Design a protein around this ligand. Structure first.
Ligand SMILES: CCCCCCCCCCCCCCCCCC(=O)OC[C@H](CO[C@@H]1O[C@H](CO[C@H]2O[C@H](CO)[C@H](O)[C@H](O)[C@H]2O)[C@H](O)[C@H](O)[C@H]1O)OC(=O)CCCCCCCCCCCCCCCCC
Ligand code: CLA
Ligand code: CLA
Ligand code: CLA
Ligand code: CLA
Ligand code: CLA
Ligand SMILES: CC(C)=CCC/C(C)=C/CC/C(C)=C/CC/C(C)=C/CC/C(C)=C/CC/C(C)=C/CC/C(C)=C/CC/C(C)=C/CC/C(C)=C/CC1=CC(=O)C(C)=C(C)C1=O
Ligand SMILES: CC(C)=CCC/C(C)=C/CC/C(C)=C/CC/C(C)=C/CC/C(C)=C/CC/C(C)=C/CC/C(C)=C/CC/C(C)=C/CC/C(C)=C/CC1=CC(=O)C(C)=C(C)C1=O
Ligand SMILES: CCCCCCCCCCCCCCCC(=O)OC[C@H](CO[C@@H]1O[C@H](CS(=O)(=O)O)[C@@H](O)[C@H](O)[C@H]1O)OC(=O)CCCCCCCCCCCCCCC
Ligand SMILES: CCCCCCCCCCCCCCCC(=O)OC[C@H](COP(=O)(O)OC[C@@H](O)CO)OC(=O)CCCCCCCCCCCCCCC
Ligand code: OEX
Ligand SMILES: [Ca+2]
Ligand SMILES: [Ca+2]
Ligand SMILES: [Cl-]
Ligand SMILES: [Cl-]
Ligand SMILES: [Cl-]
Lengths: 243, 97, 97, 137, 334, 37, 49, 202, 30, 34, 112, 34
């Protein structure tokens, strides 16, 4: 059993727990029992960004990127209700946890793409009649993506939404109109989508692991520019419990 | 050690006069400009870029934020004849502080 | 046409009263008996369609209900503003003294 | 301007009674406030919870009221949250928790009165500076 | 001689145009690495997240800076005092984002400049000189250590090291004033006496030697030709110089001993600058300038401001505005 | 060092300076319109 | 002399005092951005040089 | 003497760092909190305060996008946020009970913080080793009131100054010992000036 | 164009260092 | 008029560089011993 | 190009408010409006969370007398704020910034 | 970046004019009789 001193500085703290190859069982759902996910962990392994269409207006592709913010990317210690629905589907209702990470990835050529990688307010559901969670179970749902910066954030010229100057004070007599988009900060709130694909189940412990893919918008710099579309792929771990 | 060296003592000692004397004279010229508020306050190209691009930041833009704090926080007590009253809500401050 | 949503909110009742749906929790220190116990319950159980709905929070004591009734005249409700409630800002909005 | 008997006259209770502190009590109050309280309450603010200050208007709206000698002396024995709802001796210096806040061990009833009087007199001298924080420095 | 013996003879050779020596064996590669990285970073480095808040600051010329605004930006606050060599990053792109060039540069520089100091001792020894030029150089060197290493150590981050740039230097100074009231610190005051006095005595010595040059030339030529490199006789009249300066003030305030005078010239700026360095190096552990905020109080207890309180208001402006998105809690504790 | 015997002095007389300056100035007068375009 | 003469009054000259002079330095930073001035920069090089 | 001056200088700088960072052989009970300790204690204090008020401190996004109270270190460990991100290597008896395998544990934070931890964090936050030369406690802009400079600051600064001057003494005496041994500590022999027998550099 | 200018001046200064050191007028004892 | 913004420095350097070359050569010819 | 006219600011109660003018020392200056006796009545806040004097709260309006805007009144906070920002400079003018590609930053005159 | 369009020629002439003055003087010194 590993301690903090065993883990510190290794990179392991940013990894989700894994289950070994023998974990191909089934976890029974008693539809009379209430359930929780006691720990949901999401470890991203790839960030893909949709290239901005040249103007050909064909299918713009999601391209690889380089992570520049180090091993600071995973979502973990997330908990919430696991409802059993009348049609036998399960719905996870995210309540709390370390459910976001600012992440900066870099495109070929240098463009840096910050995003708030998140599952905030995740509501994810399985297919109907899931009498047991098995390696055939999947969860699909949506989450909230709030502005990457919150309302106090001040730009390099001191301008902000809930604080800061409301004008370009270094250009006292410039015409305001051309600068409105930079001067007037806006707070973004959009939706993301995620699929959780169960690959491993320990029937005895209630532990499941698999792969995920999420799609969401990146940072829009408080309304100063257009966000990019991001696709995040990785592994996940969850512990299901009666509660 | 350094690649060059004095070889002429008369030059060496004249240079010792020249350097600090010339420095002080230069600083005086700048202050004559400041008498008129004729400052090197800004780089215009910097400001035009930063006004349009909220992700553009340099140590130059950072120092102006400090200057704006100095001005707002010190002026009412430093310039009492102006009778400045700056309500709490107008004072420039970053997060928390 | 771009709007600063916080400035705009200041022209509503949010700028006049404690908005049970938006105002940061320290605002409840303004009135006797509200902080921290009721303040916590109010923020935790927001949003409210009307001010009186604050009386419907489960577990309240009769004393607590009466304090709430005496303080409804100091409360308002407006639409939830994402910019004011994200970031856990209702609990800590980056303002100290 | 002087530190007059009137400046030194503060509310004893919520029932209209006042007490006039002596100059020596004022000095003792400053000293004892510095000794036991100023590490968190310098200048009338509160470092570990800036939402709550020691301004007289703030103390008046506390439950029970704390804008008088009795209210403050009681606070120093049995501190509560601002609504009176929980007793916080376990995390706030008090006579009741002198075991865990050892600086409270040598404070006498007379000392508490002096500290209380300091808290009430100081804003009468300093105005907005008391509980104002850095803005008013 | 074998190869090692020959190599040693060349390294320590008094005949090399630039002295190498054993300190130089470390100095040369470290200073070259620091110089090359600095030049490339100053021209071409992308923005750096100095304060670890995903708010990259542009330091390089190609990314919108001029000579005055440009810098190599300190490494990320997320790194702190962690050692961040290139090989600890997953890629050069990550290394650059997090301010890796700053650490590479300042560590090679500090090593190289320390060896520069040793090398000064070393050559003085080979030439049969007295050894203490290197002790004079310890003053600027100590100052560089203070701003690039000791201050970061005390505050817990290389993100608080002085940036390698003109405007970044001013940023460091202003924030230092806010956080330590350095102007009110006696070690910085000794530093000012050291450099103002150094300049004064530099001009003084220059002017007095120049004033008493012995006539060896005509008016149509520089008086500098009146001195020949390596001549045995002194080129000015120290007796006339002392005769002048002793009357300017009074006899006993003037030096008649050149060795004493030149020692004073060495000692005044060096000692002052040692105190400057020690000011930074001790404010690194937050023993700060004198604090007379509200020191003067009237009979009632009204605060009567002094100039110290006006300084305080300026400092507050700096404090509240610096790193405007980095603080979440009410006190700036490092 | 032992001196290099291949060294020669270089000259430009006044007439050649005047001819050269004329060439350069007239070329500038001619090409400048195309530089500004 | 020249500096206050260009300003509103002698009030803005330096006051003769240690802390007062420090105030004068910080005023020049906040109001004039005097560190950015190449004439001050040449002064610094001549003093430090 | 010079060898010993060099050694003592080295020891001086080590002692400076020992008293600045170490809280084992320099117990914070006696010496006050370390700089790293007090900064972490501040983050702990406000996490406790705001969580009592109902904040979910794990999911609270700060103005920059990083967690207001909690974030990841560059290797992923859960650490306090704000400027104290730099101090995540700090370890102390009042904080460690909240530490799990992956760093600060959110379930422990939500459920297991004891009043003695709140008190200690508040104490350390308000006895940070910052103060003026005349012993006015706190930040440089703080008003007179609290007579405090941490023993950690007194001990670190004094020993840096001492270590520095001892390095100078080392250089002074090492350089002099060399020159005296070789016989030129009093100056160059006018009739045997070494440079005069050396070939010109150019 | 600005960047080119700054780098150009810097490069000239570095070249100047080279000449000032290796191609200085040699100091001669008379 | 919308002229090429490099025309000014192009013309200036076109004139100055070769003119200076010639002036250098002329003056050092004059200063040679007669 | 033209004087816009004299801007008169009023709050919801109809009291005349006066914008505090920028002194020459200041490159930037806050927007603070007082009544005739110097009491603060409105401002443009930096921090909004504890704002009490915002133009939105105080119902600040601006009416113009003389110049191009003579007889006009604006009540929408963005526009009223915009004119208040210009009032710190004194009388308000319309400028052609296009002809010279003017950058919005003050320069001295031949006197300076 | 929106720089001053005269900065390039200003900088170039600031360097070239005095540098050229010095080179002219240096070279004609060298060419004088030894
Ligand atoms: C012959 C000499 C040979 C020299 C050749 C060069 C070889 C390289 C030497 C390395 C240079 C030092 C750089 C790093 C210094 C530093 O960050 O030093 C800090 C470290 C301590 O590091 C800290 O150590 C801490 C340990 O505390 C931990 O453990 C504690 C236990 O109680 C607590 O729990 C605590 O909270 C917890 O964090 C943590 O790990 C921190 O994260 C970590 O930063 O000190 C130390 O290792 C020891 C002290 C180092 C000396 C200080 C350098 C000063 C020298 C400058 C001299 C000026 C020269 C003038 C010239 C003229
Ligand atoms: C690297 C740090 C640094 C350095 C080396 C300098 C260096 C300089 N600064 Mg700058 N400064 C700095 C940082 C620095 N500054 C920063 C970060 C700021 C913030 C913007 C400033 C703000 C600043 C201001 C506002 C001013 C300077 C000025 C100066 C110059 C002062 C010259 C002088 O000696 O005047 C000292 C005074 C004199 C030489 C006048 C004559 C004095 C007589 C002879 C005294 C006689 C005394 C007598 C015998 C009696 C003594 C009695 C005793 C009891 C006291 C000098 C070039 C000044 C300058 O530019 O002036 C033109 C100035 O006004 N600086
Ligand atoms: C004089 C040569 C020299 C020296 C001293 C350094 C030193 C350094 N390099 Mg640099 N480097 C050099 C030349 C040098 N470099 C050259 C020529 C290149 C081009 C290939 C580079 C390219 C380079 C890169 C890309 C990087 C460095 C980095 C570093 C740092 C860490 C090195 C390390 O981890 O070694 C570990 C080695 C040891 C601990 C040696 C132990 C073995 C000995 C025998 C034991 C005794 C040593 C002991 C500590 C005491 C010293 C003895 C003393 C008492 C006399 C350090 C500042 C890194 C950096 O700057 O990080 C921020 C980094 O990323 N270097
Ligand atoms: C600023 C650092 C510094 C400098 C410039 C010097 C300079 C000098 N030393 Mg001292 N020394 C120092 C620190 C220093 N010392 C310290 C801290 C100690 C205590 C351990 C000593 C112990 C010492 C002894 C025992 C002796 C000297 C001696 C000398 C003199 C003769 C040359 C020599 O043998 O060097 C030796 C150099 C050192 C011991 C340390 C030099 C440190 C610098 C920074 C170079 C580091 C190079 C290193 C290989 C790079 C590490 C890279 C890393 C990434 C692996 C010369 C004046 C000799 C002398 O003649 O005394 C009378 C002698 O016998 N020194
Ligand atoms: C390691 C050395 C050291 C350290 C860390 C301390 C620490 C402390 N002392 Mg102790 N003490 C010391 C040595 C030390 N002392 C010595 C040598 C004496 C005999 C004089 C004393 C006698 C003493 C008394 C009587 C008292 C203290 C007190 C205190 C506290 C307040 C200090 C203060 O206000 O400073 C004020 C700061 C100064 C006076 C400035 C000192 C600056 C010096 C002069 C600069 C040194 C530079 C360098 C060494 C010189 C080299 C010159 C160069 C050219 C070569 C503090 C905890 C007080 C206390 O609180 O007790 C409970 C107290 O009342 N100390
Ligand atoms: C003004 C001069 C001055 C003063 C007042 C001090 C004072 C102090 N120094 Mg500093 N020091 C100085 C100059 C000074 N120093 C200089 C010039 C240097 C070299 C640069 C140092 C290097 C230095 C270091 C490296 C350290 C100190 C430390 C200390 C402190 C503890 C001293 C100690 O216990 O020594 C140790 C005592 C001895 C060596 C004497 C023998 C002690 C015996 C072995 C003790 C046995 C105890 C044992 C329990 C017995 C029990 C019996 C059992 C059978 C029952 C003390 C505050 C320490 C500290 O606190 O730093 C932060 C420390 O680590 N000093
Ligand atoms: C990639 C890119 C572009 C990188 C560049 C980035 C970057 C930040 C570049 C820096 C830009 C830069 C240089 C900025 C500074 C600009 C600036 C402020 C310039 C000042 C200009 C100026 C005219 C100022 C006026 C005041 C003035 C005249 C100052 C001169 C200062 C000066 C040169 C002093 C001398 C310094 C010095 C090292 C002297 C050494 C002398 C020497 C060899 C002594 C040794 C010696 C001593 C003896 O006693 C004896 C007996 C002998 C025999 C002997 O030998
Ligand atoms: C209308 C009426 C009443 C008229 C009456 C007028 C009248 C006749 C008066 C007579 C009566 C009378 C005398 C009254 C006095 C009144 C009075 C006390 C006025 C006060 C004046 C005043 C403010 C004086 C301040 C004192 C002062 C000038 C102090 C500064 C001097 C000082 C501290 C010097 C020491 C500094 C120092 C160590 C310098 C050495 C460093 C240095 C210059 C090295 C360079 C150097 C030095 C050499 O040494 C030589 C050799 C060479 C080579 C060389 O490089
Ligand atoms: C009330 C307080 C209680 C007391 C406490 C004591 C505190 C310790 C005091 C420190 C003692 C200092 C001793 C000085 C000895 C010395 O230097 O001798 C060396 C020579 C000997 O003098 C020369 O002396 C020679 C003879 S001999 O060498 O002495 O034999 C002679 O030939 C020559 O003409 C003469 O100039 O001194 C000089 O060259 C002239 C004096 C120069 C001043 C030295 C101080 C260093 C600079 C000041 C530091 C800067 C501080 C300001 C920051 C910017
Ligand atoms: C370890 C190896 C380190 C090598 C590093 C390279 C060092 C370069 C040293 C400067 C060389 C250029 C000197 C030209 C000028 C030159 O050739 O000087 C040579 C000159 C020789 O003096 P003499 O006494 O011999 O000459 C006197 C007679 O000729 C009278 O006319 O030296 C001085 O004048 C010393 C004072 C000037 C000191 C200037 C130092 C400036 C430092 C550089 C600052 C610029 C920074 C810009 C950064 C972008
Ligand atoms: O990083 Mn650069 O400056 Ca030293 O204090 Mn805390 O941290 Mn941040 O604030 Mn203030
Ligand atoms: Ca599957
Ligand atoms: Ca335009
Ligand atoms: Cl309040
Ligand atoms: Cl800053
Ligand atoms: Cl913080």
């Amino acid at each position: 059993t590993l301690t903090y001193d065993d883990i510190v500085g290794t990179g392991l703290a940013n990894k989700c727990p894994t289950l070994d190859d023998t974990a191909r069982g089934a976890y029974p759902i008693d539809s009379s029992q209430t359930y929780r996910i006691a720990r949901l962990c999401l470890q991203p392994t790839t960030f893909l960004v949709k290239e901005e269409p040249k103007n050909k207006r064909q299918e713009a592709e999601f391209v690889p990127t380089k992570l520049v913010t180090r091993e600071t990317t995973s979502l973990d210690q997330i908990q919430g209700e696991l409802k059993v629905n009348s049609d036998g589907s399960l719905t996870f209702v995210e309540e709390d946890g370390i459910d976001f990470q600012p992440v900066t990835v870099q495109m070929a050529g240098g463009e840096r793409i910050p995003l708030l990688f998140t599952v905030k307010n995740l509501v994810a559901s399985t297919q109907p009649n899931v009498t047991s969670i098995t390696t055939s179970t999947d969860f699909k749902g949506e989450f909230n993506v709030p502005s990457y910066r919150t309302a106090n954030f001040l730009d390099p010229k001191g301008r902000g939404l809930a604080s800061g100057y409301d004008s370009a004070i270094a250009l006292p007599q410039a015409k305001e109109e051309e600068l409105a988009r930079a001067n007037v900060k806006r707070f973004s709130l959009t939706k993301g989508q995620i699929s959780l694909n169960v690959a491993k189940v320990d029937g005895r412990t209630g532990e499941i692991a698999g792969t995920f893919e999420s799609e969401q918008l990146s940072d829009d710099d408080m309304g100063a520019h257009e966000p990019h579309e991001v696709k995040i792929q990785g592994v996940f771990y969850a512990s299901i419990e009666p509660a | 050690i350094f690649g060059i060296a004095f070889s002429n003592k008369r030059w060496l000692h004249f240079f010792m006069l020249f350097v600090p004397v010339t420095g002080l004279w230069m600083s005086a010229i700048g202050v004559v400009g400041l008498a008129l508020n004729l400052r090197s306050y800004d780089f215009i190209s910097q400001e035009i870029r930063a006004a349009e691009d909220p992700e553009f930041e340099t140590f130059y833009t950072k120092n102006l934020l400090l200057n704006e704090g100095i001005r707002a926080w010190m002026a009412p007590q430093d310039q009492p004849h102006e009778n400045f009253v700056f309500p709490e809500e107008v004072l420039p401050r970053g997060n928390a502080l | 046409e771009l709007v600063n949503v916080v400035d705009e909110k200041l022209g509503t009742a949010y700028g006049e009263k404690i908005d049970l749906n938006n105002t940061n929790i320290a605002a409840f220190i303004q009135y006797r008996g509200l902080y921290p116990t009721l303040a916590k319950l109010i923020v935790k159980n927001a949003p409210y369609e009307s001010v009186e709905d604050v009386l419907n929070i489960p577990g309240l004591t009769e004393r607590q209900k009466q304090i709430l009734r005496e303080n409804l005249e100091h409360f308002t409700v407006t639409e939830v503003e994402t910019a004011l409630v994200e970031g856990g800002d209702r609990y800590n909005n980056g303002l100290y003294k | 301007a002087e530190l007059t008997p009137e400046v030194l006259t503060v509310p004893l209770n919520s029932e209209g009674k006042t007490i006039t502190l002596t100059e020596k009590q004022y000095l003792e109050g400053k000293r004892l406030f510095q000794y036991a309280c100023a590490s968190c309450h310098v200048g009338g603010i509160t470092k570990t919870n800036p939402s709550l200050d020691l301004r007289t208007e703030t103390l008046a709206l506390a439950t029970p009221p704390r804008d008088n000698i009795e209210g403050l002396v009681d606070y120093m024995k049995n501190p509560t949250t601002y609504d009176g709802e929980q007793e916080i001796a376990e995390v706030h210096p008090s006579l009741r928790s002198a075991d865990i806040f050892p600086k409270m061990r040598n404070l006498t009833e007379k000392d508490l009165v002096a500290i209380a009087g300091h808290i009430l007199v100081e804003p009468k001298i300093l105005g907005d500076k008391w509980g104002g924080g850095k803005v008013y420095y | 001689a074998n190869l090692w013996e020959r190599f040693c003879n060349w390294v320590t050779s008094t005949d090399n145009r630039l002295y190498v020596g054993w300190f130089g064996v470390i100095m040369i590669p470290t200073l070259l690495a620091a110089t090359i990285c600095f030049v490339i970073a100053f021209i071409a480095a992308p923005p750096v997240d100095i304060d670890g808040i995903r708010e990259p600051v542009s330091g390089s010329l190609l990314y919108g800076n001029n000579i005055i605004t440009g810098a190599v930006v300190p490494s990320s606050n997320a790194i702190g005092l962690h050692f961040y060599p290139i090989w600890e990053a997953a890629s050069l792109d990550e290394w650059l984002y997090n301010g890796g060039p700053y650490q590479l540069i300042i560590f090679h520089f500090l090593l190289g400049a320390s060896c520069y100091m040793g090398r000064q001792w070393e050559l003085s020894y080979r030439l049969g000189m007295r050894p203490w030029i290197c002790v004079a150089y310890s003053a600027p060197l100590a100052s560089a250590f203070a701003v690039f290493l000791i201050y970061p150590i005390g505050q817990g981050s290389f993100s608080d090291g002085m940036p390698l740039g003109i405007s970044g230097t001013f940023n460091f100074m202003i924030v230092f004033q806010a956080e330590h009231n350095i102007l009110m610190h006696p070690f910085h005051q000794l530093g000012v006496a050291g450099v103002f006095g150094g300049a004064l005595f530099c001009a003084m010595h220059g002017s007095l030697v120049t004033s008493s040059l012995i006539r060896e030339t005509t008016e149509t030529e520089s008086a500098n030709y009146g001195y020949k490199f390596g001549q045995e006789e002194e080129t000015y009249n120290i007796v006339a110089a002392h005769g002048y300066f002793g009357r300017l003030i009074f006899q006993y305030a003037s030096f008649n001993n050149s060795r004493s005078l030149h020692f004073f010239l060495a000692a005044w700026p060096v000692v002052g600058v040692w105190f400057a360095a020690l000011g930074i190096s001790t404010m690194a552990f937050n023993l700060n300038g004198f604090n007379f905020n509200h020191s003067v109080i009237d009979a009632k207890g009204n605060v009567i401001n002094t100039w110290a309180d006006i300084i305080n208001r300026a400092n507050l402006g700096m404090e509240v505005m610096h790193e405007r998105n980095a603080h979440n809690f009410p006190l700036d504790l490092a | 060092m032992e001196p290099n015997p291949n060294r020669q002095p270089v000259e430009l007389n006044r007439t050649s300076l005047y001819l050269g300056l004329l060439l350069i100035l007239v070329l500038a007068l001619l090409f400048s319109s195309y530089f500004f375009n | 002399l020249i500096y206050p003469l260009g300003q509103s009054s002698w009030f803005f000259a330096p006051s003769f005092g240690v802390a007062a002079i420090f105030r004068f330095l910080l005023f020049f930073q906040g109001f004039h951005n005097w560190t950015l001035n190449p004439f001050h920069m040449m002064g610094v090089a001549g003093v430090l040089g | 003497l010079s060898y010993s001056l060099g050694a003592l200088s080295m020891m001086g700088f080590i002692a400076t760092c020992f008293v600045w960072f170490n809280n084992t052989v320099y117990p914070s009970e006696f010496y006050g909190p370390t700089g790293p300790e007090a900064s972490q204690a501040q983050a702990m204090t406000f996490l406790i305060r705001d969580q009592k008020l109902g904040a979910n401190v794990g999911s609270a996004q700060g103005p920059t996008g990083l967690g207001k109270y909690l974030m990841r270190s560059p290797t992923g460990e859960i650490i306090f946020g704000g400027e104290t991100m730099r101090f995540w290597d700090f370890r102390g008896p009042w904080l460690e009970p909240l530490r799990g395998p992956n760093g600060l544990d959110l379930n422990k934070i939500k459920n297991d913080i004891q009043p003695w931890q709140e008190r200690r964090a508040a104490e350390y936050m308000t006895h940070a080793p910052l103060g003026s030369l005349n012993s006015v406690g706190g930040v440089a802009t703080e008003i007179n009131s609290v007579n405090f400079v941490s023993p950690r600051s007194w001990l670190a600064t004094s020993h840096f100054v001492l270590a520095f001057f001892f390095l100078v003494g080392h250089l002074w005496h090492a350089g002099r010992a060399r020159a005296a041994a070789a016989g030129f500590e009093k100056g160059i022999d006018r009739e045997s000036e070494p440079v005069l027998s050396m070939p010109s550099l150019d | 164009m600005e960047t080119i200018t700054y780098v150009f001046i810097f490069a000239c200064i570095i070249a100047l260092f080279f000449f000032a050191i290796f191609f200085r007028e040699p100091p001669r004892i008379t | 008029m919308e002229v090429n913004q490099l025309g000014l420095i192009a013309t200036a350097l076109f004139v100055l560089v070769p003119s200076v070359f010639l002036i250098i050569l002329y003056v050092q010819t004059e200063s040679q011993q007669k | 190009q033209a004087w816009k006219g004299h801007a008169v600011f009023r709050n919801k109660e109809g009291e005349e408010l006066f914008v505090r003018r920028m002194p020459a020392f200041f490159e930037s200056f806050p927007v603070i409006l007082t009544d005739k006796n110097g009491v603060v009545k409105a401002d443009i806040p930096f921090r909004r969370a504890e704002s009490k004097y915002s133009f939105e709260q105080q119902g600040v309006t601006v009416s113009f007398y003389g110049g191009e805007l003579n007889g006009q009144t604006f009540t929408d906070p963005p526009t009223v704020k915009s004119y208040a920002r210009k009032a710190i400079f004194g009388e308000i003018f319309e400028f052609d910034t296009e002809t010279l590609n003017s950058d919005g930053i003050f320069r001295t005159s031949p006197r300076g």
